[PDB]
Amino acid sequence: FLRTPTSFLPEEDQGVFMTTAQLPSGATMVNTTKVLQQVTDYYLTKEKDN
Amino acid sequence: ANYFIDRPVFAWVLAIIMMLAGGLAIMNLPVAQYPQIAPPTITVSATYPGADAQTVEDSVTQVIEQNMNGLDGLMYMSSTSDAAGNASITLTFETGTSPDIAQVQVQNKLQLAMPSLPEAVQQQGISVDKSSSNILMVAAFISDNGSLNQYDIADYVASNIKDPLSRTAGVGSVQLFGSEYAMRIWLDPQKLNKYNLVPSDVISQIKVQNNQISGGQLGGMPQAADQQLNASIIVQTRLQTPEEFGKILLKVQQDGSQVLLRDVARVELGAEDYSTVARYNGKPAAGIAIKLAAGANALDTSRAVKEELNRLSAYFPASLKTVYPYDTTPFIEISIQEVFKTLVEAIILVFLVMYLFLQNFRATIIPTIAVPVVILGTFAILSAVGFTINTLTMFGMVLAIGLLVDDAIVVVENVERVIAEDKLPPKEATHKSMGQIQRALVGIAVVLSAVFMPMAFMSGATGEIYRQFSITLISSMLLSVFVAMSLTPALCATILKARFNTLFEKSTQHYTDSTRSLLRCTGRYMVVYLLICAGMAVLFLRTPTSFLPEEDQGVFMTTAQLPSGATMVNTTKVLQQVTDYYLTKEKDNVQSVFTFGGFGFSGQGQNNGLAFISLKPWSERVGEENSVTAIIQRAMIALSSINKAVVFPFNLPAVAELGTASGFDMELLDNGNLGHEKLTQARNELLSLAAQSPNQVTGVRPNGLEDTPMFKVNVNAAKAEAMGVALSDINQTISTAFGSSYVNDFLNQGRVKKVYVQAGTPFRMLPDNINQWYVRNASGTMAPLSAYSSTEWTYGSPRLERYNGIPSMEILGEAAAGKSTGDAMKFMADLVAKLPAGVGYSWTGLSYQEALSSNQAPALYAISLVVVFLALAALYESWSIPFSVMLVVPLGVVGALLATDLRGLSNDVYFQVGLLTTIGLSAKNAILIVEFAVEMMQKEGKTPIEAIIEAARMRLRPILMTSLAFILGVLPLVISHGAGSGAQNAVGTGVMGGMFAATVLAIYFVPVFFVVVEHL
Amino acid sequence: ADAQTVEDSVTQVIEQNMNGLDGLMYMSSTSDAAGNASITLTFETGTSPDIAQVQVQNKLQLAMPSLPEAVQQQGISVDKSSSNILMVAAFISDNGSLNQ
Amino acid sequence: AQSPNQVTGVRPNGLEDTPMFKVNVNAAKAEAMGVALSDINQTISTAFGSSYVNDFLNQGRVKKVYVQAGTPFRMLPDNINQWYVRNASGTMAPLSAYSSTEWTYGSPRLERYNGIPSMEILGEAAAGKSTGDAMKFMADLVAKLPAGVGYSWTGLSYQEALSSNQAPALYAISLVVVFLALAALYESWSIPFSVMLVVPL
Ligand SMILES: CCCCCCCCCCCCCCCCCCCC(=O)O[C@H](COC(=O)CCCCCCCCCCCCCC)COP(=O)(O)OCCN
Ligand SMILES: CCNc1cc2oc3c/c(=[NH+]\CC)c(C)cc-3c(-c3ccccc3C(=O)OCC)c2cc1C
């Protein structure tokens, strides 16, 4: 009992997850839009089966 | 029931469950000095800087009052307008109204009516607050020698202490006594005239230059393509230091020189409100009152608050010391200590009584462990029901202790007697004894529940106190009955085994032979009963009625009132005299004096002053010559040589809700359409019409201020407009010069403070100063204000009052030596009817309750008597037998009344609850005797006389044991003369004088009453 | 307004007044460079959200006068709803006639 | 970051410091030449920020009206040189005359927790380790930080800590309750003692 690890509630597969893109300070929306487009392209191309 | 005898382990498990539940409840149960007794009230406060009383009443108070409708449960509302620019509306709601709901309703109404108020009032902000006055501590902060003035300490507290507090567990609110910092700009009329300037120009330049400008963003959206830069733009920020305010540019002259604010004014970090001088033992000070939370532990909260203040004391700048006037934690500790000591003493006395009468250690063992189980279970029941721990609940527990002692004693005594005779083993003897007294126990439980019920179902402030008492008593009695039917029989079946003696035997023989051969002439004793009942009338006619005895709280209050129009110099001198007296001729008793000059109880003004005097702990002041009452009695004589003042000391009420139970409060409404002068003429007809008959009313005085001279400036609009000077400019100049002008906010060390503009002191002191101010024409030429204005002296009220939207006067007075409150109220009514037609009266504060819940206690007690008779009839299976039991209660009440009159006490809530406890216990004894007689009549075929004689002879011993234990258990309450001795004396007197007479009369009167009722 | 300007004028001013609440567990607070103040008070489990909102809006009026006139005009939203998105519904154009 | 076997993906939930543009307006020179400081501030605020003016009707709905400079005129620090302020006599003067510009630094987001400055840090536990081990490791790491900084658990971590703290008291209370129930049900103190010896099994 002393050596077993503790937790609160197990993780689940809820069918949805999130991605955060944080650009260097002072960046404009052009670069943020390009980065988010890269994220969208990766998710829709390399993971189109899921 | 009876089957718990065969299962001792079940009874032990139930007892352990009760003990665990009681411990868990004690671990987490709110504690406080008193519960919520006062009805919920909501206070609405508005500030109009520089406004008069009439101006405030016209602009703010009436507008707020006209929108205070549609509030659920509102009882009444009273409004006050001061000459300092303060409007205060207090709305008192019905008991049981949720304070948060009422506060949000009042806030919504006021906040809808907000646009109708003047912009000066709106800028300050109108504050709506819940008022409970449940102060836990009042911590004051003082400067050692001279390092910090009052405003420095007040600002440091408000900015570095109030926020660390109010987040401590248990703290619900913190209120500050003092004013924080502000940027004071003192104008100079000569310098303003030199540069052709007016206060309006200064205010406008401060608004423009002490401003926050939102620059925007370089880049920002929408943005061009290939945009790679995005930053915030900073244009201007609010000023922070007095030097920055002094460098504000007002104008640039044709020469080219710059005119700055410092060139026309003095900029200084001053105070927002200068109208209060707070001193602690002659040193500048600032205080905070912590008002606790709901469901919080007063002891733990106090410990945490002291720990946090000690931790913050390392961050104090220099010579800043914390002192703690008015700490209520010691009283709550004392109450619990007294309860625990009483329980232990009762247990020891029970042990002595049983091993003086029964002479068996195993017999004495049972109650010693039975009583604490019921005590802990009562704590658990109190927690489950949703009650807290205060003085009233603990007092109810103290009485409950004797209530449980009775049940334990009778159960063990009956088991022991059935063991002693009939040669029965303990188990079957316990079975027989429990079979003899089960129905009696149930009937006693029902009778006591019906007796204690009426106190629960009361209305007003008294209802809550009586509810605490009755709930504690009922829970304790029901749990004691359950324990006596479940755990005590099992202990008797298990633990028990198969000079004074001769004296007690002879006493029993004498008593039983007298009772048997005392039926020769009973009617004489019957008329003796009549005489006794006559006593319970005559005594009841001579009881001085009170509500709650005043206790040695260790603090009291002295009010100093200068005559009229007196500046704060005279008030400060008078309060210095008061504190010097209290610290130089009462240094052995008096520890500290906290003086507030400029603030009183009849309104804020420069001729009012208050003083809070704190006393040394009871362990250091011993004797009657060092008591609170004697101290204030000597202070009354000493603080009367102070001329040009009405210095008057008195004591804090036991509960801040109410005091002066003989006194009364009334609002003399003007009604009709008569003005203030006619109303004050009617009030002057009063205070003389009532003074003409001292035999009923004594201290009829008004709770308000009287008319004072005022300065009137009449501005000639025609001349000003013809010369080219706008009337608005003149009005703004006068208002800003003599009253303050709040401009905007600035940042002091990251905190938002106000900025004020006003004239310097030597320019706003005398009427001639009005001649020093200039106003500018449309062409730019300055001309004196004396050219268009004339000055005059008028008279006007410095404080105006309204009641339910109608002007009032608030006449408060007192009753005679003995005349009752109802007669005083019914005299003041129809004394008002002699006033000029138009006026009327209303009762507020306490009298309102006494005019709304009057014919309730007799109805409740009649219902209780009917229920008790019905329960007795159901138990005895007869309609005449219960009379012999119901005709014994007056014997219980008479002795307590006699003892209370002999000691010289009053009729307090403690006396009433002790009277009820004694009545219930005597009724229990009579019930047991009559039940035994009824059993020996139903079986064994015996006449009523012999049955009642044998029942009395059998039950003499348990009655003696219970009476001795109860009388000796409350004896230390009589002899206690230290801290908190008022309630202790009341309960000791009532119980000791009631129980002895009750048992003495009952043991002899039950047989004759039974025989007489059976005959008829 | 900038982040510091908001944090001083609005955020701290509002935050000083949220003390006397019944079952408060903890309070977070945020000031943004877009001109946003986002005070967030988490109360104990079992507390009535209606009573908590009533108390919060009661104590917000004690700091409302100290707020600027550009923040008092926009209004102060006191929401008792959850802080986590339950469902997101998006709307698009089939051929592309409508812009964003 | 140098302990990937215990915590992975530790990141701050905030924004880093950014450069800021500061415009210093010469009130003395502005008043000497005639223009008002209030007009200068209003012009800058409207041009580079915005100015909500009024409400209007669009397709039967009330919407807002905004006034702002065009996109080309609020992009670069040099754009301030293109704006003019009217003198009290009607003559327009450039805004760059009575003004200077500089670059400073500032935080774009300020966070406070329980009334004091704070920074929110999110993280995850490494493979094999659980959330409790990650929380313990992060507490140990915070214990090695410069004096004056502390840490708190909020959100899911608060509930996790509360549960892990309060479990054993619940175990003991349940054991006592079941012992007492057995003793009451079977009138003997030997059956509960013989039965409670099997709980460890
Ligand atoms: C076998 C053993 C028994 C012997 C035989 C049976 C004899 C039983 C006789 C019946 C006695 C019943 C007495 C309890 C109910 C009446 C007392 C409270 C009534 C009352 O005034 O109502 C409210 C107060 O009650 C409250 O504050 C709510 C709770 C108060 C209930 C009193 C506590 C009972 C404790 C007994 C349980 C344990 C006994 C068995 C183990 C007031 O109205 P409000 O609430 O609006 O006032 C405003 C505050 N909110
Ligand atoms: C150190 C002595 N102990 C006390 C000192 C006090 O000083 C006070 C000074 C004040 N002005 C300073 C600018 C104001 C406005 C209220 C004060 C109260 C007070 C607060 C709430 C409700 C009623 C009162 C109250 O005055 O009644 C007396 C119990 C007060 C109360 C106590 C116990």
Author numbering:
A (entry chain A): 554 to 603
B (entry chain C): 2 to 499, 513 to 1030
C (entry chain A): 52 to 151
D (entry chain A): 705 to 905
Q: What text appears in the publication on this structure?
A:
Bacteria can resist antibiotics and toxic substances within demanding ecological settings, such as low oxygen, extreme acid, and during nutrient starvation. Whereas we discover distinct transmembrane state transitions within MdtF, which create a more engaged proton relay network, altered drug transport allostery and an acid-responsive increase in efflux efficiency. Physiologically, this provides means of xenobiotic and metabolite disposal within remodelled cell membranes that presage encounters with acid stresses, as endured in the gastrointestinal tract.
We reveal that drug binding domain and channel conformational plasticity likely governs promiscuous substrate specificity, analogous to its closely related, constitutively expressed counterpart, AcrB.
